[model samples]
Target chain A: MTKIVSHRGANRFAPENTFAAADLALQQGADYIELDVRESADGVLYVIHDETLDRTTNGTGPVGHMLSSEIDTLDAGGWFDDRFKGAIVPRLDAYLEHLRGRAGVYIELKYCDPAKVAALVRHLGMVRDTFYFSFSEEMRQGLQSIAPEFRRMMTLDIAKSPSLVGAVHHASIIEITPAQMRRPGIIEASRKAGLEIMVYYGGDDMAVHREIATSDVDYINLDRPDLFAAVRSGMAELLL
Target chain B: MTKIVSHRGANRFAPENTFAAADLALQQGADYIELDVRESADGVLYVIHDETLDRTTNGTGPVGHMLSSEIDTLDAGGWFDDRFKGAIVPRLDAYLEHLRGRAGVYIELKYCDPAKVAALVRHLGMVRDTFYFSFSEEMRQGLQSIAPEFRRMMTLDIAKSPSLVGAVHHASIIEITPAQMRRPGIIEASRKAGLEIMVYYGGDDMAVHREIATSDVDYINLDRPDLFAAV
Candidate 1:
């Protein structure tokens, strides 16, 4: 089976709004519990993947604009739990303490200006409890500024530029949309440049793996998190 | 006059031993030229102090025994080409070649029985030009069997036990008397122990220095090679 990454902790289970969902993912022994995070205005990092709060939470607007105090006022888990009544955005350090080396945190540092990325790395010395990934090269460059040993990954979307190779150089992993697979030069370029390529498996046509082995990319980030015969038999770092 | 180390070339015309004899020592020359070497066998190193067979040849013995090969080979003029006429055995290698680019080489492995002495440091690189009184440790095993990169030395007679500290550490750089500087323990122990001790500069009566500093440990051997401190 591809790695069973708890999409927001088997967001498929219970309500996707809380740690209970993440804990359930761990209970099921998922290979990795996928989590996303953003920074509070004062620089405290809080876990939430999107810039907008319109969907995942009851909050009506962009998530980054709300001060942590205002955001904390809104319950992040009223829907997910009677117990998680106050589990607003999880403080990164608290979440890390909860995980306590239980699994890897493929932390996507969102909403952070480049400079503090180094401050974050300097705060976290050269040991693994977390690996960093970012949607922006500016972010990866910011993190790489201070910590060379701290691993980095690039999460890509529709942007195509010559800076791709340079971005991949600073990153150890690449998270790309699967449509980019047969996209002519992407896979070959990533291979020539030596990146641990993983396809973002969140869209329709989940069975579109027919295009997977079509490239030499390394990991497959699947929303389904299940092993397809071709994927298991052929090659893919399927999320567990 | 002062002792001049003919450097690594000519052996005569210069005093048989020490570094300050030539004009090379006097005013940039030496009253005597300092020179030394080791028999390819036994690894026993000493100052030839000489370069050729003529001048001091005396015609009585071979360059290998008795009168000190260091004294007999000074061919002062030969090495400098008849212009200087009598160049002698000059081993300036200790300072010129051996001491280049390093703190300094500790012991010459010839006397301590080349085999056991070699087995010290992990460097295992070829031993370059160096100065040591003797390589005494090699003889005990005598099998030419030893470790590597273990620099060594010999002080011939100063200390009683050169290896009490144990070459177990690949003790490099040795110490010895001008006579026994080639013998074991003297330089080896002092150099091995990291002692900055002084050495007797042969006899105080000979214008030789009364004491040698550990910094000079690399150069101490066989009497006042300083030759009355001339060159």
Candidate 2:
């Protein structure tokens, strides 16, 4: 059976990319907590997916243009619901302390330097516990430069395409969407290329799950691990 | 036996002022996680105690002038020991997230504006979970002006004197050094003035433990909670 990776800390139940959601994901049997990272103008690595603060936070502005001091005060969780109002944006160090030895973390870099990120991860004794991934070429190159041995993931269509396999040659994990899972041999091809495959199932409707239930991918990254786990456990029923 | 508050998250065992030390302090049975808060040039509040980062961090220069980004990249724990090599400095928000439900935090502010600090605390739903304190009178007044109902503690000699009793009339906690515990009426006076007393034993010389342990203070803030936990 494919493993379940909680996308953005079980974002369906709690706020996305938050400690509350992360804890909930672990309790729900998520094998890994997936999150995104960015840096502040002053250089602090924060775990936010967007360059702008408007979606998840109360503040407005590009995350890169603002100082971390300004970014720290933004409400990273409140917009989800009143229950998560005080959830503040997390720093990488805090995550290392909270998640180490408890659960594995899939850290995605939208713009942060992979070298600095890898160094901090290794420094905190979390190299084996963490999986670094990124869409940014700079971040991939940064990891390649410092610690290529650190496990890296490349998300999206690049994982399915045969073209430019050399670009992601160092990557150990590749993520494709549910739509891409319809094609056969994608996972086998990726596996042959020495990469484990992860399929990101974005829909909440469990009806679409049958399409991915028997996929050859190693992991399924989903927004609702609670729902996916239920389906995963009842795979025999689905087959019947 | 008095309650043990881990000063800078068991600074003796781990890197002071980092989340690693703070978490260890809680795991070691500390009733309170004591730490300091300062501001960045852009007005972000951090949990570092010193005015300058030269001592605890590899970075050089005053903290107030630096942005949180600049402070974030600095190695905050390696100077203490090779074992704690990668611990970076923590922001106040990190404290609320990591330590909130596990244990109460004693947040001391000196240079940061109290109003902003109080807002963040209240925003995080941690106002009651935290003990607001400062050597600066302005910081306390700032809290009183906004969130007056929040509990506050007064640190240092004011624990011994009655002069600031009216100034800190609403304060419920007072922290003093072990040296002051030698005096007879300090604890009683603070208690009479409606405050609980805390003595900070900063020295490694455990010879003075006999004096502070016998004192009537409600808590003892120390770096070596592991050693004192046994006593």
Candidate 3:
């Protein structure tokens, strides 16, 4: 059975990385809530995507340049819609605690202190319930050095091969595109290398979702958990 | 004036990285011809794109795993169309020499020796007419170490800012998207940093091409050189 990992917490339906998005994701049958983590000027961890608040929030300038007090005052959700007008950017600690028991967490260290993240996850006792990834090599190396035991996900685009996921990237799981997933012996090779597989699809096509549901991968990191949940349920009923 | 760069040598019209593609690109009014370089098992450099020959060529398996003798026998053009039935993969040296006096070359180090490439460009006297880029950090570092004088292109996606293009990436050219090009002060910032700007747009929309043309970018790396030329 393929588990649904809601990217930025049903980002297609809500202002990404907010508490509301994570709640809606769980409600839509997401098994994991993926979020991006960045830090503020005061060394405070915030749940947001961009390096700047200009894209996702009613704020301007770099997230790292602003203090936590100023970031807290900005409406992180208002840019998406009026319904989430007063939704503030959730702190990493608060966000993780909220999703602690409900769903597994996929933390992407967008730009932040890896030691702080490892420390928080350890303090919260959610280390085993979470996996991490980062585009920044510095962040990836920092987190790996701080917590080598933490589960890490790496894209095949970076690692180039399933066998290299662990050796090259120190990643336990390998993420592949739909095209890569369809490639001959890719899945079998990944399994042989003792790595978990996750396919990333961000489109809304139901046929692709249904194909993914039947692909038998470990996870599908995507935007629409609701559509995939329905597809998985329908497939389950057909099996019954 | 924004110079037109034909990605993979007018790939939409001809098979990518072939002599025919390069010729067609020049005919389509491309100012630069972009090509990817990879090495064969026998240490021979081939002008091709993919690590595997399955997509672009009639051969299967990794390009690095195959000998030059075997790679030379594969039809590099038949896969695209029968019009180019006997087209063979052009050796990097041959490709460079062919495009020498015609157009500026944008050489991408896909997977090969940087020293060898630098030596070849020097031997051919095309160093001043070419710029390079690579996705591999090792490749980029190797090339930079070998020939820091060689013009290198780095994306804004990697550099994070225009200022870092030269400081961090050691690149003289910076690549950005249409969105980044539209961002306020981005062009000015690139100019302030003394870096050449290239916008990468692979789509075939004339309106977008027209917009890119009017944007005053130094270069536009695109797929359809014909459309961009028309626009």
Candidate 4:
């Protein structure tokens, strides 16, 4: 299935990774509410991409050491528009509480240190079948060791060092770019050893996706929910 | 001359530096109209501070590399408010023409490349008399070489390593921060070099400025033009 992954929680329409951005994504019919996760100064999980408070928040220090009271002062909406003022930095519990029965969550572990992420995910009991992806092999291994029941997908790109292959270890499925998809043997080879296949397609792709969609893949990850209507209208054979 | 620099172009009541920024500066009876300069990819100059088009313009790209055709399409003022919709990038010629009889023009070149800004001032012809400021020391020297008679002021924070002493080589005056006034050697050095000094003081310190007016200096650069009436 060509599933729609809401990139940064509808960032183009609202502030990226904000509850407002998430709300807008859910309202606009996003199949999976995808978000990046960071641990706050406390051990509480919050939805954000950066380790720093700059770029989006009004705060000047780091997000890792910031208390929830400090994160609330961030003007998440003012950078986009005056209409979105007072948009607070929301917690994961609040997010799950908001969308309890609504949709699946895609949690990308962006902890300052990937090792800490793996260790944290190992102990988290609240994960209700959310998709887990780690760019770091050790972190992925940590996820496998922590929760054997997690829907693990391998996230790989050229940025990986050669030493990483030994660490990625095991996967139920692998999440790779279209270029990586060219080597279908890696997919069959992983499947030959009994693993599912999942591929992520960045927004500026259509041709590469068409080839991959027909390459006997079980799941296709797409960032463009906006183009789904146009895509379905163009290709009759395409089952989105 | 007791001149008003117009804080961010008369931003108090009217909107900052669109046509409104200029209009309010003029309406407040400013002797000189101050504006910032940034060049687009198309070599088109407009009023803005930061390098990105994101803050003020609807367009997304660096101003230095954007073509004029592309720069024209950006809504520079609408991000601040809808009232400034038709506000487009004002050409230097249009601005010069607009202020031909209105007031003295003060152009602040914000982190612009040295040679390009020099070329720009050379075309302005009367650059020698018009006051300008550049954060870049190379830009100050470039402007002086382009028009030796033109007046240049370096906007300075005392924290900068090469302080007003460096700018004194090419600049007619140096604009110092309020904190810089309390520092040693700042005022003494400017006076020793026969360099005119202007102080950038927010409205908070009227008493301190009154003290400076009695001392040696050419002008007090004030953002709040409203205080001139009391002085």
Candidate 5:
């Protein structure tokens, strides 16, 4: 069965990278609640996705410049609505506690030194449930360096780079865009390498998902988990 | 010059009622950063706008049911974007300290006992810089009975009511919809009775704001201070 991963915790409804979005994803049957992690200037880890506060917060500046105390005070939710007005940035300790073993966390290392997060994962005893991934090679090494047990996934468009031939051999899971999955011999090759395939469907076509549902992909990351669930359920009926 | 109230702290750019929003509002030349006040089960006041966390947080259920510890753990920002993912609910003391000496705070009391907020206002010596407002009549009386020195504003949809006769007597300010300004004698009636007019507008129609710019209202509570600033 292809498990559903809520890309940024069903971020279509809630703000991406928020606990609210992650919790809602679990409630909607997301197998993995994906979120991004960043570190503040004071060395505390925060759960935001971008390098700056421009897109989401009322504040303007680089994320690296502010202290955790300053970052925590920003409103993280109300831009979505008045109902969410008081939402602030969460600390790693508080975020992990609220998670409380609900679902696996797909933590994206955005702008942080991965060593900080790796230290936190070990400190919180989250090695069994959490997986880390990022585009940065240094971040991947940072996770594997401190704790080899921490599951690591690589987010890249595999089709564009056939040279990443050893990519499947290195990472336990490979996340690819739908277009990359369409390329010949990729999925089977990764599976043959004993790598789990986490595919993200960015387009709005339902048929594309119906096809992905039938494939051997381990997880399908998407924004609308409800729509994907309905598509998968309908596909099951058609064969029956 | 007309005072620009950062409606929910430049809410168009930042999350409303947040320190970032308030700070951003002041940075953008706003005179006031408007925010809502609510109390948790533990009796600590938080700066939030809703009764439930359903809309803003990953947490489910009423905000009143959870302690501040539980509320603080929820993600208040990610819905806006991953950059703001870690944003959590702010405590009253932290909010006040963050906002100290920056700009005045327009406090909207929502689903909180007025006594706690009033006491904090006095304790922090925020009386000169802060003011109170609410939809509940009881909240108005509660603030009045405890601390009348804290300025109060009445948020009313003036079109339906058609009169500011009783408005000025109860509150120092009358907040109404932008359309209410179009009605003849409404702004004059408010001003004649010594009540400052604070017009709230949610839409982004520039022409409408241009008209408001020419009006005699004391303040304009808007999301885009930049847009209204241009007008």
Candidate 6:
């Protein structure tokens, strides 16, 4: 069965990266919860997107410039809707602990101390249950050097070739787009290269969802887990 | 000064891809208004982001499955806010016409007929003022074959090398990230390859904006033209 990696939790229903989103994702049959990690001015880790607080929260300024004390008070949910009026940004430690047994995690290092992330994941006993990725080459190298044993994902866009994904990029899994997935020989080449395959699709089209559900990829990192979960269950019914 | 290519217009202030957004973006100092072009079932071009209408509008299902009659009636702006309650999705022809004299255009072929796009741009007399790109290789090739003279943009992620951007990918302008721009020799190498440089940054960071503004790039494609305008 293809595992559903809910991007920033059930982001459509709740505030992204908040506990409400993660909890809702689990309820919708998400196998893994994807979260972004960044550091505050005092060096405490928080689950949020964007380098600044202006987009997701009611606060302004860079996350790295503000102390955790101030970030904790910002309304991380109100921007999304009135229903989530007072949702606080979850600290990385508590967020990981909350999903420890219930779900796997896909951690993205947005911009932070890689050493701190590695140590915290190890402390939480999620080394085997989590995988990581980063757009920053500096962050990727930092994490790779500190924790060589940690599982890491690299995009086909960056690696440029499925063959170089493992050997050159040091990724255990390769992420490809929906268009790339449909290209002939891509999946075979990925599997032959001894790397797991994960397709990244953020659109809400049911036809695309059904196509991905039946494509036999190892996982799907997507926004709407509810739709994909239902698609997978429908497939299971046919099997039975 | 770096030319600001506003992604989806002044999207932070108005419903994206609407006339309001483009007008605001121009007022906020955008040199180019970036818009995505997709086709309706009836073969009309519309400015939208998602393949499915679920994200940006009150409609559902794929855009290609709906006719222009149905699509035109759909409230494209109500989902964003009440201020834009009846914002109709702008036809590509009208959109290009609106920005013809006011600003340059960056047209992304999300999923559409390339020949149609080529004809429309040529008809609007925007052949020199507009540039094109697409994630879909099919769309890219179609446009390239039909209108080889059309200005094209390519990402460094796909081209992999500044030298290959023009020689292989056939792009006159090369798009790169802020992180890629900061790397030593990238900008110099891009210039050496004779390609125009455009940095794509979406975050609202003044520090990053200031750095990009002073970087001497040919263009900066961003979301908040208002913030970048002030920064």
Q: Going through the candidates in order, what is chain B's TM-score?
A: 0.26, 0.88, 0.98, 0.77, 0.91, 0.98
lDDT of 3 by residue, A55-93 (tens): 999899899999899999999888889999998999997
Give the CA lDDT, 0 to 100, for residue B128 in model 3: 89
Worst 10 residues of 6 chain A by lDDT: A115-124
Candidate 5 vs. true structure, TM-score: 0.48
**Cα misplacement distance, residue A14 of candidate 5 (Å):** 1.3
DockQ of each: 0.01, 0.01, 0.01, 0.01, 0.01, 0.01
Order candidates by lDDT, high to low: 6, 3, 2, 5, 4, 1
Compute the interface RMSD for candidate 5. Answer: 20.3
lDDT of 1 by residue, A70-108 (tens): 776666766565765665667665666566567555566
For residues B5-96, could you state the per-residue lDDT of candidate 6 as single tens digits?
Answer: 99998888799999888898899999998999999886788999999988888889999999888988888788888999889889997888
Prediction 6: B-chain TM-score? 0.98
For residue B148, model 1's alpha carbon misses the true position, in angstroms, by: 53
Fraction of true contacts retained by every candidate, in order, equals 0.00, 0.00, 0.00, 0.00, 0.00, 0.00
> Which of the two candidates, 4 or 6, achieves a greater TM-score against the reference?
6
lDDT of 5: 0.73
Off by over 4 Å in 5: A156-169, A235-240, B1-231
How high is the lDDT of residue B164 in model 6? 92
Please tell me the TM-score of chain A for candidate 5.
0.88
Poorest lDDT segment (10 consecutive residues) of candidate 6 chain B? B115-124
Alpha-carbon interface RMSD of model 4? 27.7
